Amino acid sequence: KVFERCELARTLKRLGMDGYRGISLANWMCLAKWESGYNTRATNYNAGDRSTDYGIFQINSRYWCNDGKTPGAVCRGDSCNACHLSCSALLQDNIADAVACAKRVVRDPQGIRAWVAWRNRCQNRDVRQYVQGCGV
Numbered sequence: 001k002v003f004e005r006c007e008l009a010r011t012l013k014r015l016g017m018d019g020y021r022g023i024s025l026a027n028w029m030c031l032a033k034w035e036s037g038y039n040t041r042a043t044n045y046n047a048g049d050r051s052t053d054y055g056i057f058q059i060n061s062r063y064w065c066n067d068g069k070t071p072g073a074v075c076r077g078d079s080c081n082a083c084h085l086s087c088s089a090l091l092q093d094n095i096a097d098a099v100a101c102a103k104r105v106v107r108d109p110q111g112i113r114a115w116v117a118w119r120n121r122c123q124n125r126d127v128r129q130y131v132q133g134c135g136v
């Protein structure tokens with residue numbers, strides 16, 4: 001599914017993303033915009049390291065979900081699939097699982113810095129435009 005901007009903002013607000021581990025809803029919106037253009041079925045293979053990015057947030061397979069096909073990995077406990085999900089779950093139209101996984105991502109030290117796209121296009125920028133007029 002390709003979300004409309006305000007429709008996603010209201011969805012994320014309902015799912016408890018506003019202010020989660022200190023990240024404003026606007027930051028999440030900025031992230032989804034630049035990562036996938038708000039498209040849940042987006043996939044990107046990293047030929048360079050054989051990992052794949054999945055869904056609206058472009059979550060990487062090396063540490064967060066299991067796709068079976070991601071090499072460079074020494075798996076301690078749940079270290080290779082910290083969200084406890086098949087990567088397939090990050091490609092559904094319903095973003096509940098994707099959101100639970102993004103929340104797990106930011107529980108690690110880097111927080112939102114986990115996404116290179118955020119560093120480049122969102123950090124220290126006026127992200128208010130992403131949520132203006134959405135009623136959130």
Ligand SMILES: CC(=O)N[C@@H]1[C@@H](O)[C@H](O[C@@H]2O[C@H](CO)[C@@H](O[C@@H]3O[C@H](CO)[C@@H](O)[C@H](O)[C@H]3NC(C)=O)[C@H](O)[C@H]2NC(C)=O)[C@@H](CO)O[C@H]1O
Nearest residue numbers: 058059060061062063064079080105108109110114115116
């Ligand atoms: C959105 C996304 O998928 N982003 C990817 C990044 O998560 C990934 O960075 C690596 O993330 C893992 C998991 O957070 C890092 O490991 C954790 O590091 C902290 C540091 O103290 C430690 O507390 C955790 O125990 C440790 N976890 C594990 C499972 O080892 C890892 O250090 C990050 N690597 C770098 C270079 O920052 C990057 C790189 O694979 O890909 C993004 O796409």
Ligand SMILES: [Cl-]
Nearest residue numbers: 084085086089
């Ligand atoms: Cl699953």
Ligand SMILES: [Cl-]
Nearest residue numbers: 066085086087
């Ligand atoms: Cl699995």
